[PDB]
Design a protein around this ligand. Sequence first.
Ligand SMILES: *[C@@H]1O[C@H](CO)[C@@H](O)[C@H](O)[C@H]1NC(C)=O
Ligand SMILES: *[C@@H]1O[C@H](CO)[C@@H](O)[C@H](O)[C@H]1NC(C)=O
Ligand SMILES: [K+]
Length: 301
Amino acid sequence: VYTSTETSHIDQESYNFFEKYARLANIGYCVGPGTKIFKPFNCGLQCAHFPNVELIEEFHDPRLIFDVSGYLAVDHASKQIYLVIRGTHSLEDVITDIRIMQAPLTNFDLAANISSTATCDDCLVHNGFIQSYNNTYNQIGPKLDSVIEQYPDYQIAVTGHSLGGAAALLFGINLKVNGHDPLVVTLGQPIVGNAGFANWVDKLFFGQENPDVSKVSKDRKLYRITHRGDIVPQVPFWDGYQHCSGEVFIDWPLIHPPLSNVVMCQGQSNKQCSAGNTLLQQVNVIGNHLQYFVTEGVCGI
Ligand SMILES: *[C@@H]1O[C@H](CO)[C@@H](O)[C@H](O)[C@H]1NC(C)=O
Ligand SMILES: *[C@@H]1O[C@H](CO)[C@@H](O)[C@H](O)[C@H]1NC(C)=O
Ligand SMILES: [K+]
């Protein structure tokens, strides 16, 4: 596994870009029962930061513990199509499953829209996260394709928090091997697959193994935002699992971190970042997993 302790600071434009995706991910918690996103795109404070955005479709499946909910929208101001995904089930229930239950690792080429030749032969991923990816594809994939055809020069951006972040990573990989050029930003994302998968994802997105991911740049298309004290990005840890590169770490205990305290981390594990979370920092598992620029997991704040 490529390890490092190198980190780099960011500028305010990059901080505002990460905050943006944190907000869009938060809005994913406005989909489901008891909540709503009103057309065009109204859902209280967080949707109010998105003029000229129209909700296309929401989706919600509660059938299985790894099923997903979320929405598809088009932002005519930024010329982007947004796919935003979350886990349908409570964060407590989902994280308990990921933390404690041992998935058999499955080849990503078994997932929807992935051809037998698109992945490396050793590209293995947690069977639950494949289900989250599949469940996203089966609910929204055809609608996303029709919207891509309708707005063919808009940039596709996939984002999600928690299990949504795992589904987003895989859905971005689906779009990328299938000829699109998506932006993928995940928050609080658990480790998806093994060393084969992680290194293949780094080649796919950064163009080499052990990529220099110290910079935010117009052409970079993968960011994994993590927060001090959140253990979700540290599980599952069954040896075998490892992250791809691309970590952006909020080294701050609260929402709304100072600019100095969001850093770009080198490597697939970095003790200056998530891998260095101390035992006292890890204690409050759900609360620390919500603190990503804005509070994630609750609609309307
Ligand atoms: C994913 O969904 C497709 C239907 O689009 C199905 O063919 C496939 O077997 C599913 N894969 C897994 C691992 O569930
Ligand atoms: C599925 O793959 C096809 C064939 O490459 C691609 O054209 C299409 O956009 C993909 N659809 C989704 C929703 O990923
Ligand atoms: K990963």
